[model samples]
Target: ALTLYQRDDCHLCDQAVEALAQARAGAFFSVFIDDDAALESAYGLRVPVLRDPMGRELDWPFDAPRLRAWLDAAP
Candidate 1:
């Protein structure tokens, strides 16, 4: 599954999730960086990152087309 690296109270993360839901992209998961030190350090300020299982990443600040592209590339 694709994994979304995000933080709590993050509006952008919320928007990303909503967009993913709207796209019917169900084969994904979300990871809150706040609760994990390694993830927090790696993506602390980069919340809302989208990563495929092999670690191909899409940094946030995205739109529908970008999200759709990522989903399309996901395995």
Candidate 2:
């Protein structure tokens, strides 16, 4: 499975989500970092982070192809 670290009010995160939706890849769990202090600190104003189950992350500035490539490479 995959996890998406994001914020509810972030435009970039929204755009990232839109991109992912358009990509229509495998489903992923979403984590909003607003109320969670630890997650907020873990990602302050930097988001749309893709976390893999294997403890790896695809952090920022990614699109569909990049998303696919990372999953392809992830363990």
Candidate 3:
């Protein structure tokens, strides 16, 4: 499983979603950092971050190939 951290009305977050789709990534949940303080502090400026079930975090600017590699290497 995977989780995506993002903010509302974020352009990059939108791109992240598109990248995931192009990559054909597996099931994932999106977490909004708009109202949560802790989430904001952790991923406020780093919206569009992807986290795997093992707690590995992948920052933004990822494309389909990168996303695939990350998923393929998931533990």
Q: Candidates' TM-scores?
A: 0.83, 0.87, 0.95
Leading candidate by lDDT: 3
Residue range 1-75, candidate 1, lDDT tens digits: 778889999799999888777766668888888888999899998879988767788888877778787778766
lDDT of 3 by residue, 1-75 (tens): 689999999899999999889999988899999999999999998889999889999999899999999888878
lDDT for 12 in candidate 1 is 94
Error of 3 at 64 (Å): 0.5
Candidate lDDT scores, in order, read: 0.83, 0.82, 0.92
Where is the poorest 10-residue window by lDDT in model 3?
66-75
User: Between which residue pairs do clashes occur in model 3?
Assistant: none
Candidate rank order under lDDT: 3, 1, 2
Q: Model 2 misses residue 74 by how many Å?
A: 1.7
* Clashes per candidate, residues 3 or more apart or on different chains: 0, 0, 0
If the candidates were sorted by their TM-score against the true structure, best first, what order would they fall in?
A: 3, 2, 1
TM-score winner between candidates 2 and 3 = 3
